[PDB]
Write a protein that binds this DNA or RNA. Structure first.
Ligand SMILES: Cc1c(N2CC[C@@H]([C@H](C)N)C2)c(F)cc2c(=O)n(N)c(=O)n(C3CC3)c12
Ligand SMILES: Cc1c(N2CC[C@@H]([C@H](C)N)C2)c(F)cc2c(=O)n(N)c(=O)n(C3CC3)c12
Ligand SMILES: [Mg+2]
Ligand SMILES: [Mg+2]
Ligand SMILES: [Mg+2]
Ligand SMILES: [Mg+2]
Lengths: 208, 482, 482, 210
DNA sequence: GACTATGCACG
DNA sequence: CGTGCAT
DNA sequence: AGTCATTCATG
DNA sequence: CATGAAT
């Protein structure tokens, strides 16, 4: 299920977590195989705050992540015995894409916090517009246009140019700034209890 | 090449972006036409493409493709499964899509894939789209920015209650059951005349849900509770008969089952009862359903207590279930838990909006023309000098100009006059044009009145509402008790 | 009730229908445009829908659905898979469909489903359809009987040889390899001048196959046999290099592989040689192919006989394989095993029919216009008299009869005059019309000459083929050895 | 895989071998469950006159049609033990419908001839046209007096399936009847055999390309 | 969205 | 075996 | 063309 | 455990 790097190097190597088998393929095809591995997430990733640790373990996407990163899960987790210097979550710049980022992150917080706290978890930002633009702002500079609907409309040449190439890519580094407020936020948005969530949404989401 | 965001920060934007979309634009229906985005697109698209009840069916895949390419930016399976559901008359009380082939069954077996089936809109579906071409409803651009699409349909009948909805978003979910069309309309008509009507009175017209699968609905108190607050547990229970078999044996005979219950799974679950002898006296469970009737036969042993068994089945199977109301819908962009009254009220508000819009449009058209027809009537009176002036003109632009300057035509009249084909000059019958001038005025009067008189408008609304009911009404299927 | 039928007789009737169908309408290409029916519908449909190289891409699903709904009555996987191959530039020498997104690789991994990809016709596809709108090609009713579709495309270039085909029917199969566009055209143009040309001479223009995957083709003698009989067995061997490495170790490097071979399986089947120590010397097998260049590194041990290894691999893997020509195609509705001459002649024949039809069409159009223009020129010298005559008529038909009778205009002229918009009486400029008239007579002449003189027609056929060559020409990719 | 009849009756019970899972479902819905069974054939059926008997007994459909007719296959075939009186082949009226009928027939001939011999193997003729329904271009002209052109079973509702093709009291059936055991062998082998040349020739001699 | 099995002709 | 339109 | 997993709220 | 639009 995993497409691994060519040589083992826990100081360069990178694990790309890609939404969907299809964009999985384009990443497998556009990457630099020497130091870039590909793990396609095929479907919506299990919620690790809501589910039983029993189920969390029996989960394909979840096992192969533990196994591929090879650093153990939860308590028995040693950042030392890792496999990658960077773990990169790459999804469509669409809402379900965001949802997926959300679920992966709650897994990495609840069961590999060290990894997140050590700044090894990143988030690839695919271009929003076609030259390329990421900002409704750059788009103006550029106009002096295909609105991308997901990774699946991108050629492997373009993926690399814009979002896999360390030289040309714009990344997000996920940091834990206030351990207290982070656990609050994660447990609210992703937990078993609905009402705190609804409330959160009413108070925070602007329906207009 | 690298930007830092906090967990609390990213986790926030992401879940917010998603939560919002899933609420406004996925799982929950618009309170006015009772449709979720996917469904609205299915209908609008198929309709734009002339794929209607009076015309031959199209390949399902063709429809699905055009929805995807034009309006809905999501999986084709989502779109098709949506389409197939609108075609299943054991889920929709009034079905919006007619489909040829295997579109599934009450045994929950898989529908033929979109390569096999064909579809058109149902006739009633027509009425959800009625007058869409008259600028009666807000449009917006599609993802492509190549096409405008409607954000809500005209809805010449109140679909949200007739067909219901379910129902799983983030922070909110939905369960609205089907209702009888004639009934919902009687209530709406009443509420038009009596804005401040109370539930107790409304329920005289709209007594309770009417499931396409029929059955028995028990619990007038909880029904009332739901119509008031949008929440309520009610009981739904199978229509049963007791046949006497030879040898002093009896047979329980099921003929209608609860909404959303898989017939085949039921029959199995009942048999598991006979096989484990959880209760005593079941001889054989036997599905006898054919293409034109539902019928499960439970044969009992001689000397089995048939009430004891029937009760066991109602309790420990889905032969009887609890239906939970949970009426959430999208009102003014936001999720809103709502009962019978804000629903009907919103439907009405909407129909008002539509009818005004519709009437402005029609009247705008009759004006534009009535205006041309005056122009022509005058031209005839001075044909000779007008041909003379166009002859003198240096070109179209100048001709229109000379027409305005010398005879006080308006741009629009100028354009009409100047684009007449020569053979018009043969006609000097003004009288016919006057009969038209008259019919147009008359028409505009009636229109303006609607726009400018609230009562006159609402009467229209009622007239039309009753037409719909006369045309599509059918009898109740589900019986009510307490 | 029931009818009796014999096993002998039924098997005959059924397999007869299948056989015929799968032969002429599925698996084998038409000898003229080199397309299987499904390929032709794909192109014709995407073109009808303005899904062309110069316009934006388009959800693959939208396209597939319209194809399925209007023309090709089969699975969508068949249709989408066909459409994908047409976009894969390691299968087609000259791809006919451009496709954004994961449309496979040489490693054979699955292309994104039509849910995900977007497509449009390649620019060259344009030329296969050139003049489709000018009655240059025999049309037929679609299964619906709702829309006519082409039975062959105009083919502005000889696609059968350029992109090849393949190829499994009943009783027949086909394998025709890709060819260099510039070469094929050169051959064609020669044969146009020299109808009786023999293979030896054509091979000075069409030396042999040009795979888009490159490599080395070996067998000048079997190539002739194939170009003559339709069958032949040539050899294809991978392009390789040797790189000297640190430590005095050498390394084999493959940069081109044989047509229709899976890079991924190859590499496995090669590392299996290493692993079974089938030949001595292999350190490591390594795919190093990346988005811009194929590259398989075979690293050897310290003292290893590199010419030994390289040979063993050619012999015992697919680093070298045998391609088999088996050139079957549909000529006059039947399957015909055919070689380079039947093919090109058929192409020429066809291009002859198109250019003739095209010209008949354009001429007729031009005469009609000329006729009108002639009428308008008279009308100007009698503008007023004509206007007066129309005024004096009773209606449109009366006007035309007075035009015919009083000034000897023809029905078609009268209609033109009588349907002019009023503003025209401002542009009363006869010189510019006389200019158009001249331009028109000149055009009609040029066109009449083509229809009336074979050699003039064949010069066009040649002029045009060269325009295409100038525009789409590219270097050979496969090298030839004997 | 199989959908059994409700009551076991070697005298009435019918076996409906239907092309594809979806039309098989449409049939499962419109059948008369008392005596009509349904065994979907999921894609093109194996050519039993071309393949090794090993790979033939490993085949999902073949296996499951031998083991539900319950008479065994080959020499060990006892017509007397069979579980249905009628075996009915129901395919689209399209060309691959034609092809499948071919493939199935060659199976029954080769490995269950007694069945074919006894007049127990039929072919259902679905209607070609709906204006009511018609099966013959001729029958069409009569209906035209007082048009959907069916492209497969896929576009028929169970109601329609039953009314026209599954209802014993309504449907036209074709009864496959071996007239001459000698000619029928040559016919099956030319068309379905492992040898290409004969067949290519047969096509050249018989199929009118126009 | 991957996987699974067939036919048909051909080395 | 593997190819490519079909089921 | 079925099979397989997951999300989200709910009782 | 299902429900039904999504991946
Ligand atoms: C059924 C079936 C299969 N299987 C798997 C088992 C096999 C056995 C022989 N029935 C059937 C199979 F393995 C693959 C397909 C298939 O790819 N595409 N595109 C299809 O449309 N179908 C449907 C038949 C048309 C498939
Ligand atoms: C992947 C996937 C599945 N599975 C089954 C295995 C499971 C693994 C565990 N994630 C993935 C699955 F079981 C079903 C679907 C599916 O129905 N539709 N319509 C889809 O588009 N997909 C693709 C994901 C988008 C499906
Ligand atoms: Mg997406
Ligand atoms: Mg119960
Ligand atoms: Mg070899
Ligand atoms: Mg078919």
């Amino acid at each position: 299920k995993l497409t691994p790097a060519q040589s083992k190097n826990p100081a360069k190597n990178e694990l790309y977590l890609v939404e969907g088998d299809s964009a999985g393929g384009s990443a497998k095809q556009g990457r630099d195989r020497k130091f870039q591995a590909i793990l396609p997430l095929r479907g919506k990733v299990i919620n690790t705050a809501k589910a039983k640790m029993a189920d969390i373990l029996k989960n394909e996407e979840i096992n192969t992540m533990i196994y591929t990163i090879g650093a153990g899960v939860g308590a028995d987790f040693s950042i030392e015995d890792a496999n990658y210097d960077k773990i990169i979550i790459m999804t469509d710049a669409d809402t379900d894409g965001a949802h997926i980022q959300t679920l992966l992150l709650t897994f990495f917080y609840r069961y590999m916090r060290p990894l997140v706290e050590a700044g090894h978890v990143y988030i690839a930002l695919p271009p929003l517009y076609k030259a390329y633009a990421w900002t409704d702002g750059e788009l103006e500079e550029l106009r002096k246009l295909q609105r991308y609907k997901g990774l699946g409309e991108m050629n492997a040449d373009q993926l690399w140019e814009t979002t896999m190439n360390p030289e040309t890519r714009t990344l997000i580094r996920v940091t834990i700034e206030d351990l207290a407020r982070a656990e609050r936020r994660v447990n609210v948005l992703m937990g078993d209890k609905v009402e705190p969530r609804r409330k959160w949404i009413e108070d925070n989401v602007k329906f207009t | 090449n690298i930007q830092n965001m906090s967990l609390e920060d990213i986790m926030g934007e992401r879940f917010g972006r998603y939560s919002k979309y899933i609420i406004q634009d996925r799982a929950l229906p618009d309170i006015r036409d009772g449709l979720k985005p996917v469904q609205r697109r299915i209908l609008y698209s198929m309709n734009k493409d002339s794929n209607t009840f009076d015309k031959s069916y199209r390949k399902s895949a063709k429809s699905v493709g055009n929805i995807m390419g034009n309006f809905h930016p999501h999986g084709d399976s989502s779109i098709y499964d949506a389409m197939v559901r609108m075609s299943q008359n054991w889920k929709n009380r009034e079905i919006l899509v007619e489909m040829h082939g295997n579109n599934g069954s009450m045994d929950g077996d898989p529908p033929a894939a979109m390569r096999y089936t064909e579809a058109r809109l149902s006739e009633i579906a027509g009425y959800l789209l009625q007058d869409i071409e008259k600028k009666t409803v807000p449009f917006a651009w599609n993802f492509d920015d190549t096409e405008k699409e409607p954000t809500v349909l005209p809805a010449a009948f109140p679909n949200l209650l007739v067909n219901g909805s379910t129902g799983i978003s983030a922070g909110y979910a939905t369960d609205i059951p089907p209702h009888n069309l004639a009934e919902v309309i009687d209530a709406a008509v009443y509420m038009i005349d009596h804005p401040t009507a109370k539930i107790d009175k409304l329920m005289e017209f709209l007594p309770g849900p009417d499931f396409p699968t029929g059955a028995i609905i028990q619990g007038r108190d909880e029904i009332k509770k739901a119509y008031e607050t949008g929440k309520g547990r009610v009981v739904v229970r199978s229509k049963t008969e007791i046949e006497k078999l030879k040898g002093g044996k009896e047979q329980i005979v099921i003929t209608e089952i609860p909404y959303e219950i898989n017939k085949a799974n039921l029959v199995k679950k009942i048999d598991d009862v006979r096989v484990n002898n959880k209760v005593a006296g079941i001889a054989e469970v036997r599905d006898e359903s054919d293409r034109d009737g539902l019928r499960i036969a439970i044969e009992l042993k001689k000397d089995a207590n048939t009430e004891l068994v029937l009760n066991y089945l109602f309790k420990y199977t889905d032969l009887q279930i609890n239906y939970n109301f949970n009426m959430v819908a999208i009102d003014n962009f936001t999720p809103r838990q709502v009962g019978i009254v804000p629903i009907l009220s919103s439907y009405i508000a909407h129909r008002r909006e539509v009818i005004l819009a519709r009437s402005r449009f029609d009247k705008e058209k009759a004006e534009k023309r009535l205006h041309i027809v005056e122009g022509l009537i005058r031209v005839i009176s001075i044909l000779d000098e007008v041909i003379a002036l166009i002859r003198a003109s240096e070109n179209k632009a100048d001709a229109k100009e000379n027409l305005k300057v010398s005879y006080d035509f308006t741009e629009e009249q100028a354009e009409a006059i100047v684009t007449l084909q020569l053979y018009r000059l043969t006609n000097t019958d003004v009288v016919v044009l006057q009969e038209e001038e008259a019919e147009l005025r008359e028409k505009i009067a009636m229109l303006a009145a609607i726009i400018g008189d609230e009562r006159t408008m609402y009467n229209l609304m009622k007239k039309e509402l009753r037409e719909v009911k006369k045309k599509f009404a059918t009898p109740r299927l589900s019986s009510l008790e307490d």
